[PDB]
């Protein structure tokens, strides 16, 4: 239960937010840092 | 490379963390060797259009 | 020199000798030992021999186990248990002087 | 002991009760509230816990036949069975995870022929992880298994 | 039959003072209790070889062995490289009940302890009880009657 | 939000798992006879097989032995539970039974009882005062009382601070008059042996028991060595053949003494345990005691031991290494992405993965244990894997 | 000067009882001959450190010697490795018999 | 041995620490060969022969 | 490492000395070790600069 | 008993023999304690001299 909760919560937020946010940074860095 | 730096984590608890990093890193190493040996060979002659 | 040499042997040699990486340690001195300086003339006057002093000192300075009062196995229905303290090591110079 | 005057003999029987008994009566052991004894076993440093438990059980099983009538062995307190079941509880998840992953893999890939490729590589890696573990000397344990479930 | 005070001042210190020169020693805790059983436990630095660590500590115990009281030497002064938590407690019980509590202790103490104490992976074997030891219960009233002394 | 949750999460070593066996400790006040302990231990045995009949399979009550120190006034009771599957729900887990048991044992007036779950490893803070100057046991004991009594002044930062050594108990001191012994013609060795043999078992010889060697002990019968007045019965033979009683050449007086002297690093000491504040982490409690130990009688130092000593070595290596991991992954990422800028797009995603772990970790009080660190160090990988699986194609 | 039983029941049993905790102890066999000789042979698992095996077994004996009789202590008890075989046995003889 | 070279007899407790008890002759009485003629030994009859 | 450990150990017992007692290190080789390494590493740094 | 059975299976066992020596006659000397103390001779002397 200790390990599962640590990653179960992490994974859920790692996909319902990463897909929305990962694109944001890519354009931002390539537009602001390139 | 995310897990390897903790492998050197010292102290009495060092062994605890140290084992986890090596097995995860070792798992990746075997996962990329097989994924470059079995998976390419398997995907041919196994996967069909 | 005797006083200071005692303290280092008394309370620092042990601690230092157990520090990691430290092997044998040689102490330039010696810890207190309750020296019994004897006079041959005094023994002659009182008609004593040194083998008598060692026998006497070895007896009145003895620490002996004395069991446990009401110790196990007890008689059914006991409500007390305590150690019994017999003769003990002497702990001062004047104390040894009281030896007869 | 002595032959006092008048020729009377005094034997130890007449000055002291004699009866076999324990060296020290300090420790009394009771099992389920009835008389019993036992051995407390401390694991030697560096020795595998389960291996020691298996060896001890075999040794005791090597002595059961010769016990006197009515004498029975009992294990009132044993930490080792927890370790055995605990590790064999993670393996259930590891095998369960592969099945669950394969089931999810089938739903998306929508092709059983293609869905079978992932489920061959994963067992190879997980089994292989044990071989490399032996090389490093690590002992299969709770965290090392968790080092493969994740 | 030793008061807690003497064991501190005639057994613990004598062994403790000579306990120097050991390698990879973190701390050395010890205690003496009313029953008269000193227990000096040394914890070495992590990673050292317990196989030789037990050799170094005992080799320095020899310099202190003769100085201990004659009674303690006669007893089983022992050094064990074992942990301080029981791995598993093996209990012996008599279903019929024809054997008193002390009787069961002897059988486990007389046959089991020797075999188990040698099994590989066992450091220490604490026994809850005591092996048969012929007790000569004296009667001071009877001893005085015949003009005898213990 | 990740930073706020991260700090608020308490720090702990490893959860206390339901191993299916807990050790119940039973102790009695000073000078409690073995009979009394057997009386109480029956209550513990009786309680477990009546109130916890559904949970406990067997109980192994050992009287006269304990971790705090062997003796008559101490007791232990090994307890093992039924199969984990045979204990459905959380109300029947190890932590639950002990809380019920310890609360249920508040009615054992004479005895102190508390069942504590076996720790993670085989073997809270273990703080120990050391009399490094030579004050003496009595002087140190009051010093221990002062610090522990003063520890009650900071309940918000310390909790359950207690001693671990048996307290002083009455001792029946007997002194032998040296002059009287010589006049009565009784050798001192004779006095010591009879006193030390009758009232305490004296190993003598060995004998053969059904093919085995076993010790033969000589010790006074039970009934004749039970009360202080019994000393008047043990006549000791003089050199001239006369018999003299103990009362004729000796005196006795009750006095206080310690039944379990403890030592540390070659110096006298006793051990005090306890928890570190309500809810806070163990690290905080350590510093406060140093301040408390700062104002103590001269010659009274301190040193850590047990698990607390481990925390003094490699105390805060976790934050240092993560900096290396973040640095190393940055360098490695830039190597594959051919830029010093793109690797950010897969690093600024790390909080999105960590927040889920922290949010769920605090959602169930995971208390940042070891199992969490691997959880944190793997979810970060999953987030990196997800990001690397997205930006890679975009490039 | 001892018979068979007085050696087994006073030396062998005392030594065997206190031989515990040895590392990788495979099986312990001992015979108590007449003429007051006892040979307690301990065999370990293959591949173990012979040097470590011999020191541990002797060390446990060193903590059991006080229980042995006075004569045995004076006569001393040795700890010799056995499996090793002789490279050669140099024999010394007298060709005339003048000296025995 | 006790008179000239000293003889360790037993221990004693000082400041809570064990220390040796030594019996030895005073300095001025064991420093010359002449001093050997001052030491007396108690015979069975207690005549203290030198 | 030992020398620092010894120095740390002495600092532990320094506050509890009797009045007038002081610690002095008349003879120690560690200062030479520190300077020697510091001198050598300086030379190594100078080697790169040259 | 066990060896006697092995002698009845020649086809399966051969030369089954004991390794240790068999029983040998011994000379028993009984030192009667009653007479030993009556004669006023220490028991340890009897054992020591013998």
**What gap in Å lies between CA H36 and CA H3, rounded to an integer?**
10
Residue listed under structure tokens 């001693």: F163
* Dist. CA F82–CA G91, nearest whole Å: 71
> Could you give the CA distance from residue F100 to residue F104 in angstroms, rounded to a whole number?
6
- List the single residue in E27, E128, E131 with the smallest CB-CB distance to F62: E128
A20 CB near a chain F CB, below 8 Å?
A: no
Task: Write out the DSSP string of F277-331.
Answer: SSSS-HHHHHHHHHHHHHSS-TTEEEEEEHHHHHHHSSTTHHHHHHHHHHHHHHH
Give resolution, Å, one decimal: 3.5
For residue F226, what are its two tokens? Answer: 């039970």
Tokens coding H35: 């001093």
Structure tokens at I7: 């120095």
- DSSP single-letter state for residue F136: -
What is the rounded CA–CA span in Å between residue A22 and residue A18?
5
Instruction: Give yes or no for a contact between F61 and F41, defined as CB atoms under 8 angstroms apart.
Output: yes
* Rounded CA Rg of chain C: 21
What the block records as the tokens of D28 is: 């009394």
Task: Give the C-alpha separation, F12 to F124, whole Å.
Answer: 10
C-alpha F354/C-alpha F364 separation (Å) is 16
d(CA D94, CA D99): 9
Other CB atoms within 10 A of residue F88 CB: 8
Q: Is the dihedral of CA E46, E47, E51, E54 positive or negative?
A: negative
Rounded Cα gap, residues D150 and D101, in angstroms: 13
Cα distance between residue F375 and residue A9, in whole Å: 10
CB contact under 8 A, F199 and E1: yes
- All chains having 3 or more CB pairs closer than 8 angstroms to chain B: D, F
Ordered DSSP codes for chain E: ---HHHHIIIIIHHHHHT--S-SSEEEEEEEEETTS--EEEEEEPTT--HHHHHHHHHHHHHTTTTTS-HHHHHS------EEEEEEEEEEEEESS--S-HHHHHHHIIIIIHHHHHHSTTEEEEEEES--EEEEEEE-HHHHHHTT---
Kindly report the length of chain A: 34
Residue with tokens 């104002």: F295
Structure tokens of F134? 């030579």
Query: F134 in the Ramachandran plot: left (φ > 0), alpha (ψ -120 to 50) or beta?
Result: left
> Distance between CA atoms of G69 and E136, rounded to whole angstroms?
22
Q: What are phi and psi of D136, to 5 degrees?
A: -75, -10
- Do D138 and B23 meet the contact criterion of CB atoms below 8 Å apart? yes
Give kind and range of the element (H or E) at residue F250: strand F250-257
Q: Cα dist. G53→E119, G79, G81 in Å?
A: 15, 11, 10
Work out the end-to-end distance of chain B between its first and last CA atoms, rounded to an integer number of angstroms: 37
Closest by Cα among C11, I7, C13, E42 to F301: C11
Structural gaps in chain H: residues followed by a C–N separation over 2.5 Å? none
Q: Could you tell me which residues come within 8 angstroms of residue F263 by beta carbon, excluding any fewer than 6 positions away?
A: E8, E12, E16, E29, E30, E31, E32, F269
User: Cα(H16)–Cα(E10) distance, rounded to whole angstroms?
Assistant: 11
Token reading at D22: 């324990």
Maximum pairwise Cα distance, chain A:
44
Q: Cα dihedral angle (C29, C30, C32, C35), rounded to 10 degrees?
A: -100
Q: Which of F78, F122, F261 sits opposite E4 (nearest CB)?
A: F261
- CA-CA-CA-CA torsion for F182, F183, F184, F185, nearest 10 degrees? 50
CB-CB contact of C61 with H21 (8 Å):
yes
Q: Can you tell me the distance from the alpha carbon of G55 to that of D83, in angstroms, rounded to the nearest whole number?
A: 34
- State the chains in contact with I (3 or more Cβ–Cβ pairs under 8 Å): C, F
Pairing state between β D34-44 and E82-94: antiparallel
Measured between alpha carbons, how far is D129 from D94 in angstroms, rounded to an integer?
Answer: 13
Q: For chain G, first and last CA: distance in Å?
A: 24
Q: How far apart are CA E140 and CA E122, in angstroms?
A: 44
Question: Do the Cβ atoms of D38 and F60 come closer than 8 Å?
Answer: yes
The answer to whether G and B touch (≥3 CB pairs < 8 Å) is: no
Tokens at F222, concatenated? 């039970």
In whole angstroms, what is the distance from residue F329 CA to residue B4 CA?
Answer: 10
Backbone angles phi, psi at F203, to 5 degrees: -60, 135
The DSSP secondary structure of D66-87, one letter per residue, reads GPPTTEEEEEEEESHHHHHHHH
Q: How many CB atoms lie within 10 A of CB H47?
A: 10
- The tokens of J27 are what? 């000379």
The two beta strands, F212-220 and E132-138, are: parallel
Q: After which residues is chain D broken (C to N over 2.5 A)?
A: none
Give chain G's radius of gyration (CA, Å): 17
Tokens of E92: 């012996």
Q: Is F244 helix (H, G, I), strand (E, B) or coil?
A: strand
Report residue D61: phi and psi, to 5°: -65, -20
- Phi and psi dihedrals of E122, rounded to 5? -115, 120
Vertex F252: Cα angle to C81 and C75 (nearest 5)? 30
Angle at E79 between CA E73 and CA E84, to 5 degrees: 130
Q: Residues 62-121, chain E: which have Cβ within 8 Å of D?
A: 80-102, 104-109, 111-113, 115-116, 119-121
Nearest CA to CA, how far is B12 from chain D (Å)? 15
* DSSP-derived secondary structure for A4-34: HHHHHHHHHHHHHTHHHHHHHHHHHHHHH--
| Residue for token pair 């004996």 | G61
Two tokens, residue D6: 């008048």
What is the per-residue burial (b if ≥16 Cβ within 10 Å, else e) of H28-37?
Answer: ebbeeeeeee
How far apart, in whole angstroms, are the C-alpha atoms of residue G17 and residue E110? 10
Task: Work out whether strand C82-85 and strand F169-176 pair parallel, antiparallel, or are unpaired.
Answer: parallel
**Are 3 or more Cβ–Cβ pairs between J and D shorter than 8 Å?**
yes
Report the chain A residue with the minimal C-alpha distance to residue D90: A1
Residue with tokens 């370990």: G44
The reply to whether residue F218 touches residue E136, judged by beta carbons under 8 angstroms, is: yes
Which is nearest to C70 in space by CA: F281, J8, E67, F169? F169
Neighbouring C-beta atoms of residue F195, cutoff 10 Å: 26
Task: Give the closest residue to I18 by CA, choosing from C10, E104, G23, D39.
Answer: C10
Residue whose entry in the numeric block shows the structure tokens 């085989």? F122
Burial of F78 (0-12, 13-18, 19+ CB in 10 A): buried
**DSSP tag of H41:** B
Query: For strand F267-275 and strand F260-264, is the pairing parallel, antiparallel, or unpaired?
Result: antiparallel
**Please, where are the H alpha helices in chain I?**
2-13, 30-49
**Chain C nearest-CA residue for H20:** C33
Residues of chain H with C-beta less than 8 angstroms from the C-beta of E14: 11, 18
Beta carbons of D29 and F65 less than 8 angstroms apart? no
Look-up of token digits 């560690």: I30
Residue of D nearest to J35 (CA): D3
Which residue intervals of D1-70 are DSSP H helices?
49-61
Cα–Cα distance, E132 to E130 (Å, whole number)? 7
Q: CB-side exposure of C9: number of CA atoms within 13 Å?
A: 19
Show the beta-strand stretches assigned E in F28-166.
Answer: 56-63, 74-81, 112-117, 125-131, 159-163
Per the structure, the complete domain to which residue G26 belongs is given by 1-82
Please provide residue D22's backbone torsions phi and psi, each rounded to the nearest 5 degrees.
Answer: -65, 155
DSSP for J4-22 reads: HHHTT-TTT--S----S--
- The region that residue D37 occupies, defined by phi over 0 for left and psi between -120 and 50 for alpha, beta otherwise, is beta
According to DSSP, residue D45 is labeled T
Q: Is J31 helix (H, G, I), strand (E, B) or coil?
A: coil
Task: Name beta bridge partners: D10.
Answer: D2
Q: State whether residue F35 is helix, strand or coil.
A: helix
Q: List CB contacts of C57: < 8 A, sequence separation 6 or more.
A: C36, C96, C99, H9, H10, H21, H23
d(CA F270, CA J32): 57
Residue J44 vs residues A4, E91, G35, J33, J36: alpha-carbon distances, Å: 77, 44, 22, 11, 10
Query: Helix-strand-coil percent breakdown of chain D, rounded to 5?
Result: 55, 25, 20
**Tokens representing residue E144 in the block:** 């005085």
Q: Measured on CA atoms in the order D27, D33, D35, D40, is the torsion positive or negative? A: negative
User: Is-contact F381 B4, C-beta < 8 A?
Assistant: no
The whole-angstrom separation of Cα F197 and Cα F247 is 18
- Per-residue tokens: I38: 């510091």
What method was applied to determine this entry?
cryo-EM
**Residue matched to tokens 């440093």:** D45
The alpha carbon of residue E119 is apart from the nearest alpha carbon of chain F, in Å, by 20
The C-alpha angle F377, F382, F388, rounded to 5 degrees, equals 125
Total Cβ atoms within 10 A of residue F283: 13
CB within 8 A of G83, min separation 6: which ones? none
Q: Among C82, C95, C100, which would you mutate to test the F interface (most chain F Cβ atoms within 10 Å of its Cβ)? A: C82
Is F14 within 8 Å of D70 (Cβ atoms)?
A: no
DSSP state letter for F45: H
C-beta neighbour count of F95 within 10 angstroms: 14
DSSP letters of E39-74?
Answer: EEEEEEPTT--HHHHHHHHHHHHHTTTTTS-HHHHH
Q: Which helix (H) or strand (E) holds C80?
A: none
Give the HSE-up count for residue F392: Cα atoms under 13 Å, Cβ half-sphere: 8
- Which residue of G20, G23, G54, G56 to mutate against E (max E Cβ within 10 Å)? G20
| CATH code, domain with E2 | 3.30.70.1430
Note whether F51 and F104 are within 8 A (CB): yes
Contacts of D128 in chain B (CB under 8 A): 30, 34
Peptide bond into H33 cis (omega under 30): no
| Tokens matching residue F84 | 């984990």
F-facing residues of H in 1-50 (CB < 8 A) are 15-17
Residues of F in contact with I13 (CB under 8 A): 132
- Gap between the Cα atoms of G45 and G23, Å rounded: 9
Q: What is the radius of gyration, based on Cα positions, of chain B?
A: 16
- The verdict on a CB contact (< 8 Å) between H17 and E13 is yes
DSSP-derived 3-state class of residue B33: helix
Q: For tokens 């040979």, name the residue.
A: G39
Give the residue from F134, F264, F265, F299 with the most H CB atoms within 10 Å of its CB, the best one to mutate.
Answer: F134
Cα R_g (chain I), whole angstroms: 17
d(CA G32, CA J44) in angstroms, rounded, equals 25
Please list, in sequence order, all residues whose beta carbon lies within 8 angstroms of the beta carbon of residue F153, skipping any fewer than 6 positions away.
none
Phi, psi of D15, rounded to the nearest 5 degrees? -130, 0
Q: Under DSSP, is residue D7 helix (H, G, I), strand (E, B) or coil?
A: helix
How far is Cα E26 from Cα C20, in angstroms, rounded to an integer?
Answer: 7
Residue D148 CB neighbours (<10 A): 21
Give me the architecture of the C30-100 domain, per CATH.
2-Layer Sandwich (3.30)
Residue J49 Cα to chain centre, angstroms? 22
Cα E134 from Cα E132, distance rounded (Å) = 6
Closest CA to D72 of F95, E96, I40, G48: E96
Q: CA G49, G55, G58, G60: dihedral to nearest 10 degrees?
A: -100
- Taking CA atoms, I20 is separated from H14, I14, I17, I23, in Å, by 22, 11, 8, 10
* Tokens describing residue F177: 């008059």
């Amino acid at each position: 239960n200790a390990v599962g909760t640590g990653v179960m919560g992490g994974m859920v937020t790692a996909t319902v937010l990463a897909i929305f946010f990962v694109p944001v940074f890519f354009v931002v860095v390539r537009r602001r840092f390139s | 490379a995310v897990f390897v730096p903790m492998a050197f984590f010292g102290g009495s608890t060092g062994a605890i963390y140290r084992q986890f990093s090596i097995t995860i890193v070792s798992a990746m190493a075997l996962s990329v060797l097989v994924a470059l040996i079995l998976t390419p060979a398997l995907c041919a002659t196994m996967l069909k259009p | 020199q005797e006083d200071i040499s005692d303290y280092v042997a008394a309370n620092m040699k042990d601690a230092i000798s157990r520090t990691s990486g430290v092997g044998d340690v040689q102490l330039f001195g010696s810890q207190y030992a309750m020296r019994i300086w004897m006079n041959p003339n005094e023994l002659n006057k009182f008609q004593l021999t040194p083998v008598d002093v060692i026998t006497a000192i070895k007896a009145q300075n003895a620490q002996v186990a004395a069991g446990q009062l009401g110790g196990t196995p007890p008689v059914k229905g006991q409500q007390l248990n305590a150690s019994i303290i017999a003769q003990t090591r002497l702990t001062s110079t004047e104390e040894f002087g009281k030896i007869l | 002991l002595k032959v006092n005057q008048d020729g009377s003999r005094v034997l130890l029987r007449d000055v002291a009760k004699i009866e076999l008994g324990g060296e020290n009566y300090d420790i009394i052991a009771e099992f389920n509230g009835q008389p019993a004894s036992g051995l407390g076993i401390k694991l030697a440093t560096g020795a595998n816990a389960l291996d020691t438990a298996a060896a001890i059980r075999a040794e005791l099983a090597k002595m059961e036949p010769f016990f006197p009538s009515g004498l029975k062995i009992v294990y009132p307190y044993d930490t080792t069975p927890f370790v055995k079941i605990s590790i064999h509880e993670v393996v259930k998840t590891l095998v369960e995870a592969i099945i669950l992953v394969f089931l999810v893999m089938y739903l998306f890939l929508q092709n059983f022929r293609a869905t079978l490729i992932p489920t061959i590589a994963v067992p190879v890696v997980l089994l292989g992880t044990f071989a490399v573990l032996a090389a490093f000397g690590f002992s299969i344990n709770t965290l090392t298994m968790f080092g493969m479930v994740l | 039959g030793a008061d807690a005070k003497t064991v501190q001042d005639t057994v613990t210190q004598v062994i403790e003072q000579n306990m120097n020169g050991i390698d990879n020693l973190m701390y050395m805790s010890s205690n003496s209790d009313s029953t008269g059983t000193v227990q000096i436990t040394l914890t070495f630095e992590s990673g050292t070889d317990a196989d030789i660590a037990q050799v170094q500590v005992q080799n320095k115990l020899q310099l202190a062995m003769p100085l201990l009281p004659q009674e303690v030497q006669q007893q089983g002064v022992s050094v064990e490289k074992s942990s301080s938590s029981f791995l598993m407690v093996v209990g012996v019980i008599n279903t019929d009940g024809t054997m008193t509590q002390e009787d069961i202790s002897d059988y486990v103490a007389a046959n089991m302890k020797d075999a188990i104490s040698r099994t590989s992976g066992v450091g220490d074997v604490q026994l809850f009880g005591s092996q048969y030891a012929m007790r000569i219960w004296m009667n001071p009233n009877e001893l005085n009657k015949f003009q005898l002394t213990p | 939000g990740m930073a706020y949750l991260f700090v608020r999460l308490p720090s702990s070593f490893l959860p206390d798992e339901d191993q299916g066996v807990f050790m119940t400790m039973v102790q009695l006040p000073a000078g409690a006879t073995q009979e009394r302990t057997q009386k109480v231990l029956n209550e513990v045995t009786h309680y477990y097989l009546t109130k916890e009949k559904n949970n406990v399979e067997s109980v192994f009550a050992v009287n006269g032995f304990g971790f705090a120190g062997r003796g008559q006034n101490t007791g232990i009771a090994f307890v093992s539970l039924k199969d984990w599957a045979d204990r459905p729900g959380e109300e029947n887990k190890v932590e639950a039974i002990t809380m019920r048991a310890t609360r249920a044992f508040s009615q054992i007036k004479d005895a102190m009882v508390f069942a504590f779950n076996l720790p993670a490893i085989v073997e809270g803070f273990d703080f120990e005062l050391i009399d490094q100057a030579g004050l003496g046991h009595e002087k140190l004991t009051q010093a221990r009382n002062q610090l522990l009594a003063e520890a009650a002044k900071h309940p918000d930062m310390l909790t359950s601070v207690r001693p671990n050594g048996l307290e002083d108990t009455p001792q029946f001191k007997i002194d032998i008059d040296q002059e009287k012994a010589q006049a009565l013609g009784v050798s001192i060795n004779d006095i010591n042996t009879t006193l030390g043999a009758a009232w305490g078992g004296s190993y003598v010889n060995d004998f053969i028991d059904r093919g085995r060697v076993k010790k033969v002990y000589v010790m006074s019968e039970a009934k004749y060595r039970m009360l202080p007045d019994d000393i008047g019965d043990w006549y000791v033979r003089a050199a001239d053949g006369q018999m003299v009683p103990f009362s004729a050449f000796s005196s006795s007086r009750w006095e206080y003494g310690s039944p379990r002297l403890e030592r540390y690093n070659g110096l006298p000491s006793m051990e005090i345990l306890g928890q570190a504040a309500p809810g806070k982490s163990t690290g905080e409690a350590m510093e406060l005691m140093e301040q408390l130990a700062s104002k103590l009688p001269t010659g009274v130092g301190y040193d850590w031991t047990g698990m607390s000593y481990q925390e003094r070595l490699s105390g805060n290596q976790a934050p240092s290494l993560y900096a290396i991991s973040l640095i190393v992954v940055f360098l490695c990422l830039a190597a594959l992405y051919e830029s010093w800028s793109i690797p950010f797009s897969v690093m600024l995603v790390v909080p999105l993965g960590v927040i889920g772990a922290l949010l769920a970790a605090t959602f169930r009080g995971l208390t940042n244990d070891v199992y969490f660190q691997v959880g944190l160090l793997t979810t970060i990988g999953l987030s990196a894997k997800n990001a690397i699986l997205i930006v890679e194609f975009a490039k």
